[PDB]
């Protein structure tokens, strides 16, 4: 149906997870509590959360034919995630990583295997019929190509009435100067704690006041700060805050940011206020932190 | 599965594990996200590695080990088949995980950090072994793990051999590679007993000669005890009391020693299974494992 789906453009990675009691010291040999294979990656994880929340969703990302992609595709389908827009690559490998999750505190150590796999381009995005989407979320990576995709969405929206415009969100998660041009695109801009700290900011309040001038007219800038909850700032100038909802036992924080992002997107897509969406994001990601994986989030 | 001729195969009973190996510039701090230089998925495990070598040496061979249905087992089974290893006797498990380890190798200093597989998968039991028709095997090699259950499997092989003529008896070998006291009862079983340098050093022995003379009294009548000592070659000792030695055949450049013990073990087993002498099998074991050390993986062992 027209204007019914939420699209997430980004990465998909096969995470081989080991759950440990204590983080291994260098040059030591420890035994894990349990092992897992999880479909991971920023946009891919957000799609999982969106499907668990009851939102019809679709993933757009690069994958290469093979047994790693075969596992990932079957998991996307198991979670009712639309994979029709996946950019299949003739050359390269589908990403895979080693994740060490500390059971005593939820810390997640990641050894990524970045592969030759080309990024999703603006020409790949050109081929996408935008009518089926109500929201499009893009994870900042190949910034110059992504700006064209965002301009395509802006152009599409100039021909639509207010109730038919596709809402857009962007995430600047890596501290790379190429990505900072993405701040000026989208209705909602998520900027990570890592990026904020690299830019010299020491709190979510400092970052939002310091970076708001970079967002486009009327946009909302969101900054999550792990156990300190999350803050948002919109055109009225009023800083909003939500305390975190930490679990009494933190066991798995892998994908907590993606859970927060998907939950804020979901709440805003349902007509909820920015203050409510901020709270809801902390509530869902807080519950995730006390669980292995994403089952049991709602 | 196809017809396997009677008394043609070499069986290795033991472990199979999926080893995810990552080469890094710097060791990752806890809760950090780093990018590795290279990643590798390798089928590992002592018995599993010996099967690979046996297939490359030209021996028909089979693996017996625990696996649980799933994606990790799917990868391992496809790798066993890639190396022509018979997996018909695998003990499939209803509960547990197929073993998998994470190895982080620091490129700047050679350090290896290992997150070892969990223990949820049950080991191959004596009741699982009872159900196996032994006629297709000429040799059975057991990797010491769940010692009390393995002793029953060894007694089953002994009983089988009491009803066979000399040319139909299945030759047996055991490996004591881990320094655990439960395993030391396995010294008294098998025609050939391999004991690792690690085990020998833990028992207070400082050379392969010290270990063989020190432990020979624990082996069964007429058995051969074998001990490899990395760059110092390898020694064997049988009932004649003569300590046999072979110098190592190191490669021009050492590249990869992972599975060198398993290569030595499979090569000694192979040579003895072909009717060669203990001295000849010892030399052959050093020659094959020496060539392996100068290669990545097992391709090119010849
Ligand atoms: C407010 S919701 C939120 C939004 C974004 C992110 C960033 O996540 P990201 C992109 O690094 O995946 C995290 C969270 N939430 C949380 N993060 C926690 N930590 C993230 C650190 C990195 N790893 C472990 C560290 C601790 C801990 C908690 C707690 F309280 F449970 F202990 C919550 C909660 N609640
Ligand atoms: C005699 S053949 C043999 C049989 C068994 C094993 C044990 O294997 P294992 C349980 O470690 O899998 C190793 C070998 N051979 C060798 N091992 C080498 N090292 C393995 C050690 C582990 N610590 C560092 C050491 C380096 C080195 C060499 C050399 F000389 F080429 F450099 C040979 C040769 N030749």
From Swiss-Prot, chain B:
Q: In which tissues is it expressed?
A: Most abundant in liver, kidney, gut, spleen and pancreas. Low levels also found in adrenal, muscle, brain and eye.
Q: What top-level class of enzyme does the UniProt entry assign?
A: transferase
Q: Which InterPro entries match?
A: Ketohexokinase-related (IPR052562), KHK (IPR034093), PfkB_dom (IPR011611), Ribokinase-like (IPR029056)
Q: What is the residue range of the signal peptide feature?
A: none
The gene from which this protein is expressed is: KHK
Presence of the UniProt keyword Nucleotide-binding in the record: yes
The entry's cellular-component GO terms read: cytoplasm; cytosol; extracellular exosome
Positions binding ATP in this chain are 112, 230-233, 259-262
The biological processes this protein is annotated with in GO are: fructose metabolic process; regulation of glycogen metabolic process; response to fructose; response to glucose; response to insulin; response to sucrose; response to zinc ion
Q: Mind telling me which PANTHER family this protein's record contains?
A: KETOHEXOKINASE, PHOSPHOTRANSFERASE SYSTEM TRANSPORT PROTEIN
Assembly: Homodimer.
Please report the name of this protein according to its UniProt entry. Ketohexokinase
Which organism was this protein described from? Homo sapiens (Human)
User: What is a single molecular function from GO for this protein?
Assistant: fructose binding
**EC id:** 2.7.1.3
């Amino acid at each position: 149906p027209r204007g019914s789906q939420i699209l997430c453009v980004g990465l998909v990675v096969l995470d081989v997870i080991s759950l440990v009691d204590k983080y291994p010291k260098e040059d030591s040999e420890i035994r894990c509590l349990s092992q897992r294979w999880q479909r991971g990656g920023n946009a891919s994880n957000s799609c999982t959360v969106l499907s668990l929340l009851g939102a019809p969703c679709a993933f757009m990302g690069s994958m290469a034919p093979g047994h790693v992609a075969d596992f990932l595709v079957a998991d996307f389908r198991r979670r009712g995630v639309d994979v029709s827009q996946v950019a299949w690559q003739s050359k390269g490998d589908t990403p895979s990583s080693c994740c060490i999750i500390n059971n005593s505190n939820g810390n997640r150590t990641i050894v990524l295997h970045d592969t030759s796999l080309p990024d999703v381009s603006a020409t790949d995005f050109e081929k996408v019929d935008l009518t089926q989407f109500k929201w499009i979320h893009i994870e900042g990576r190949n910034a110059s190509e992504q700006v064209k995709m965002l301009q395509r969405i802006d152009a599409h929206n100039t021909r639509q009435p207010p109730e038919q415009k596709i809402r857009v969100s962007v995430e600047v998660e890596k501290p790379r100067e190429e990505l900072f041009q993405l701040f000026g695109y989208g209705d909602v801009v998520f900027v990570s704690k890592d990026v904020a700290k690299h830019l010299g900011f020491q709190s979510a309040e400092e970052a939002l006041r310091g970076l708001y001038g970079r967002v486009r007219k009327g946009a909302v800038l969101v900054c999550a700060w792990a156990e300190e909850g999350a803050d948002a700032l919109g055109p009225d100038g009023k800083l909003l805050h939500s305390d975190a909802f930490p679990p009494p036992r933190v066991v798995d924080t892998l994908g907590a940011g993606d859970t927060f992002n998907a939950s804020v997107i979901f709440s805003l897509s349902q007509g909820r206020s920015v203050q409510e969406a901020l709270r809801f994001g902390c509530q869902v990601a807080g519950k995730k932190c006390g669980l292995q994986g994403f089952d049991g989030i709602v």
